[PDB]
């Protein structure tokens, strides 16, 4: 058991050193190079009819690659686009890029390719003043990654047209801007964070090693996480911006764990215990808390596996492997290292009031317990207002509003969207499939169109129903099948989408043929519906699982349901404050971002994380309160000893959470600013208001009830082998 590994680490000291040092360099080269090999197109389309209709549509008519990049060309010296010499010049320039990238571009299409054309919409492309015209440059590729790599192959030559004066916007210029914000945020973090975390560590300690240890743990952590994921990638892959967030969160709570390990070790050394005895009780003492915290986090993450998605699933998978690897390094490499040197790790030093505050905390807790209603009244009245704002919530999807207002690409896009209205559309698709496989008659088409025309409220920009519900264009790379045909059309107001969506699904097609209703508005409204359909069951599993787990940690049945209710209150209050600052806009002008609806599954993730985090700190605290109560003594003694042996710990764990929170205020990315700020604010509010107000008051209210426990449940607890408090 632990005694065995205790003696084995001395007998195998040489190989654990040779392996773990070899592993970090090996994991570094294999990790920095390889293992992240997953696509970015496909984290949201999961099941439903709209996705089947999208695969069938792409399979028959072929993927449409014209809506990738739109470049706006402007002649210098205020010359108009009708200038013929310039057009020839840029055409040769265009032909020059066509000469250099035949393997990436199919070709260019637009009014320039046919100045004298009878096509209405193309004559509607030129602006009424004949001063601006934009062209589309489709690129080769079967997925967005190959496309992006082609954009990076062509961006130089495309950015060199018009003597360098050319603004590049669109899908690929934006994807490039996003991943570049990734690199800017990583480097910003490594040049703003490692010095800040260096001075914060140096200002809390007095010896170099104690402050240098969390950094050593941090470097080994990312190396071992990249190695874990390299092993994970043979079965399931991990991707995205969601990886650095996983490294900052894991490295943070991991430093918290090693903070509680260095603190408990210094404490046992100061009481006068030898290294072995101290390490054995700290091991079990910490390890039992980490095991409880981990099983709690697992119960917080598995329900998402009850309802799959993708991006979220990959993150919950990353969290489980990150917390488990953190616990393993906490109870293996670190504990052994601290065991050999011991207190002479603090010997050399930099050669070249905590008790007064702890007493103020004791006098203040005695004042609170002395006049509790003066605290209970304001807290519970503060409670009603938390959910007032919660009701206001709206749910939406991704769009160009997701970037900061000073980004060049967004303004270029907004200019395109105001200069050339009507070209950008999000249409609903009517995918038609016959099971006989035989062709669809012209009459069957005029009949389907007449029934789609029996529903009002659908856009008609031409002002003519004969031209409505056109057939989709057939590209030269689709397996044309007369068994499938699709017609599409946008909405005048995306808000009537929900109403009209129910009208589209309710239509009865002809006898033998089947109709599929698709398009991006339907996938979004079906994920929204499925989430608000499975939200009650999610909360149900979350509550029953956390209550039984607390019924196992504690011996009571009322205390777990009480903590569950107070954790639900904290949850509701957190999402109510978030809706109160992100939906109505109070605070948007200062932090520089635009208020808009949130992506619901991210609110599910934040609820699970906050719940598990507050529960872990509740188990750590009441776990020490119960250990002291189980050691005898009166209630006031157990209270004082608890809020005395941990005031300095919860204070340092808070300083740490604030340093990391300042690193997430520097984490950039607007949708990351909303999430990271939500977690930081709620975490500080709960960890400085909820725990310290609610706990002393509730325990006081219970009184002697705090110790009751059914007899058969105490024998069950004893029959499993648990109770080494």
Curated annotation (Swiss-Prot):
Please list the GO biological process terms of this entry: cell wall biogenesis; cell wall organization; mycolate cell wall layer assembly; mycolic acid biosynthetic process; phospholipid transport; regulation of membrane potential; response to antibiotic; response to xenobiotic stimulus
Gene Ontology MF terms: cardiolipin binding; diacylglycerol binding; phosphatidylethanolamine binding; phosphatidylethanolamine transfer activity; phosphatidylglycerol binding; phosphatidylinositol binding; trehalose transmembrane transporter activity
The reported effect of residue 660 to G is: Binds to ICA38 with a dissociation constant (Kd) value similar to wild-type
The segments labelled Disordered in the record are 456-484
Parts of the chain on the Periplasmic side: 36-196, 239-240, 312-317, 394-538, 584-601, 671-674
Q: Where does a 1,2-diacylglycero-3-phosphoethanolamine bind?
A: 40-44
| Membrane topology annotation | Multi-pass membrane protein
Q: Where is the composition biased (Basic and acidic residues)?
A: 464-483
Tell me, in one coarse class, where this protein mainly resides: membrane
Question: Cytoplasmic side of the membrane: what ranges?
Answer: 1-14, 262-290, 560-562, 623-649
Summarize where SQ109 binds, as residue positions.
Answer: 616
Keywords assigned: Cell inner membrane, Cell membrane, Cell wall biogenesis/degradation, Lipid transport, Membrane, Transmembrane, Transmembrane helix, Transport
Q: What is the effect of changing residue 659 to G?
A: Binds to ICA38 with a dissociation constant (Kd) value similar to wild-type
Return the annotated site residues (Part of the proton transportation network).
562, 618
**Regulation of catalytic or functional activity:** Inhibited by the antimycobacterial compound BM212, a pyrrole derivative. Inhibited by the antitubercular drug SQ109. Inhibited by the adamantyl urea derivative AU1235, the indole carboxamide ICA38 and rimonabant, the antagonist for the cannabinoid receptor CB1. The dissociation constant (Kd) values for SQ109, AU1235, ICA38 and rimonabant are 1.65 uM, 0.29, 0.16 and 29.5, respectively. Inhibitory effects are due to binding of the inhibitors at the proton-transportation channel most likely dissipating the transmembrane electrochemical proton gradient needed for substrate translocation.
Transmembrane segments in this chain: where?
15-35, 197-217, 218-238, 241-261, 291-311, 318-338, 373-393, 539-559, 563-583, 602-622, 650-670, 675-695
* Additional information: Binds antitubercular compounds N-(4,4-dimethylcyclohexyl)-4,6-difluoro-1H-indole-2-carboxamide (NITD-349) and 1-((2,3-dihydrobenzo[b][1,4]dioxin-6-yl) methyl)-6',7'-dihydrospiro[piperidine-4,4'-thieno[3,2-c]pyran] (SPIRO) with Kd values of 0.05 uM and 0.8 uM, respectively.
Can you tell me which family this protein belongs to?
Belongs to the resistance-nodulation-cell division (RND) (TC 2.A.6) family. MmpL subfamily.
Known role:
Transports trehalose monomycolate (TMM) to the cell wall. Flips TMM across the inner membrane. Membrane potential is not required for this function. Transports probably phosphatidylethanolamine (PE) as well. Binds specifically both TMM and PE, but not trehalose dimycolate (TDM). Also binds diacylglycerol (DAG) and other phospholipids, including phosphatidylglycerol (PG), phosphatidylinositol (PI), and cardiolipin (CDL). Contributes to membrane potential, cell wall composition, antibiotic susceptibility and fitness.
The name on file for this protein is Trehalose monomycolate exporter MmpL3
Q: Which taxonomic lineage does the organism of this UniProt entry have?
A: Bacteria, Bacillati, Actinomycetota, Actinomycetes, Mycobacteriales
UniProt gene name = mmpL3
């Amino acid at each position: 058991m632990f005694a065995w590994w205790g003696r084995t680490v001395y007998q195998f000291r040489y190989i654990v050193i040779g392996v773990m040092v070899a592993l970090c360099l090996g994991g570094g080269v294999y990790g920095i190079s390889l293992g992240n090999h997953v696509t970015q197109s496909g984290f949201y389309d999961e099941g439903s009819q709209s996705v089947a209709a999208s695969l069938i549509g792409d399979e028959v008519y072929g993927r449409d690659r014209t809506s990738h990049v739109v470049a706006i060309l402007t002649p210098p010296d205020d010359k108009k686009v009708t200038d013929k010499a310039w057009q020839k010049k840029v055409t040769e320039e265009l032909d020059q890029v066509v000469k250099d990238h035949e393997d990436q571009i199919v070709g260019w299409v637009g009014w320039l390719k046919a100045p004298d054309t009878t096509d209405p919409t193309v004559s509607a492309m030129k602006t009424q003043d004949l001063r601006h015209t934009f062209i589309s440059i489709p690129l080769q590729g079967d997925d967005d990654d190959e496309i992006l790599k082609n954009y990076q192959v062509v961006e130089p030559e495309l950015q060199q047209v018009n003597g360098g004066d050319i603004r590049l916007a669109g899908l690929n210029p934006l994807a490039s801007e996003l991943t570049g914000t990734i690199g800017e945020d990583q480097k910003r973090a490594e040049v703003a964070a490692i010095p800040l975390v260096a001075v914060v560590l140096f200002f809390v300690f007095g010896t170099v090693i104690a402050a240098a240890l969390p950094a050593i743990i941090g470097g080994l952590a990312i190396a071992g996480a990249l190695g874990i994921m390299r092993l994970v990638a043979e079965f399931t892959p991990v991707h995205f911006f969601a990886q650095p967030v996983v490294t900052l969160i894991g490295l943070g709570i991991a430093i918290d764990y090693g903070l509680f390990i260095v603190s408990r070790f210094r404490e046992e050394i100061a009481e006068g215990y030898d290294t072995e005895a101290a390490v054995r009780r700290t091991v079990m003492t910490s390890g039992r808390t980490v095991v409880f915290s981990a099983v709690i986090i697992v119960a917080s993450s598995v329900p998402l596996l009850l309802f799959p998605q993708g991006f979220l699933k990959s993150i919950t998978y990353a969290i489980i492997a990150s917390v488990m690897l953190a616990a393993i390094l906490s109870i293996t490499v670190l504990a052994a290292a601290l065991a050999i040197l011991g207190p002479r790790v603090d010997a050399l030093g930099v050669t070249t009031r905590e008790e007064v505050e702890r007493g103020f905390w004791g006098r203040l807790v005695n004042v609170v317990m002395k006049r509790p209603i003066a605290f209970a009244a304001p807290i519970l009245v503060v409670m009603v207002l938390l959910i007032i704002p919660l009701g206001q919530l709206s749910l939406g999807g991704i769009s160009e509003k997701y970037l900061p207002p000073d980004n060049a690409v967004r303004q270029s896009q907004e200019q395109f969207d105001k200069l050339f209205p009507g070209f950008r559309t999000e249409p609903l698709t009517l995918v038609m499939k016959r099971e006989d496989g035989e062709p669809i008659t012209d009459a069957q088409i005029a009949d389907m169109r007449a029934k789609a025309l029996t529903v009002s409220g659908f856009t008609d920009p031409d002002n003519d129903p004969e031209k409505m519900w056109k057939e989709r264009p057939a590209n030269d790379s689709g397996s044309k099948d007369p068994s499938v045909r699709v017609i599409q059309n946008g909405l005048e107001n995306r808000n009537d989408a929900a109403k009209k969506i129910d009208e589209l699904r309710a239509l009865q097609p002809p006898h033998g043929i089947e109709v599929f209703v698709g398009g991006t508005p339907a996938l979004e409204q079906d994920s929204i519906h499925s989430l608000f359909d499975k939200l009650p069951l999610m909360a149900l599993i979350l509550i029953v699982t956390t209550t039984v787990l607390m019924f196992l940690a504690f011996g009571s049945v009322v205390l777990p349901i009480k903590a569950a209710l107070m954790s639900a209150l904290t949850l509701g209050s957190t999402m109510g404050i978030l809706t109160w600052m992100f939906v109505d806009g109070h605070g948007s002008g200062l932090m520089n971002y635009t208020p808009q609806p949130l992506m619901a599954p991210m609110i599910g993730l934040i609820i699970a994380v906050i719940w598990g985090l507050s529960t872990d700190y509740e188990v750590f605290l009441v776990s020490r309160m119960v250990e002291a109560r189980e050691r005898g003594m009166s209630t006031a003694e157990a209270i004082r000893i608890g809020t005395a042996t941990t005031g300095r710990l919860i204070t340092g764990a808070a300083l740490i959470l604030a340093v990391v929170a300042g690193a997430f205020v520097f984490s950039d990315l607007v949708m990351m600013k909303y999430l990271a700020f939500g977690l930081l604010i709620a975490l500080l509010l709960d960890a400085t208001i909820i725990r310290m107000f609610l706990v002393p008051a509730v325990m006081k209210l219970l009184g002697d009830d705090c110790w009751w426990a059914p007899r058969w449940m105490k024998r069950v607890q004893e029959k499993l082998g648990l109770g080494e408090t």
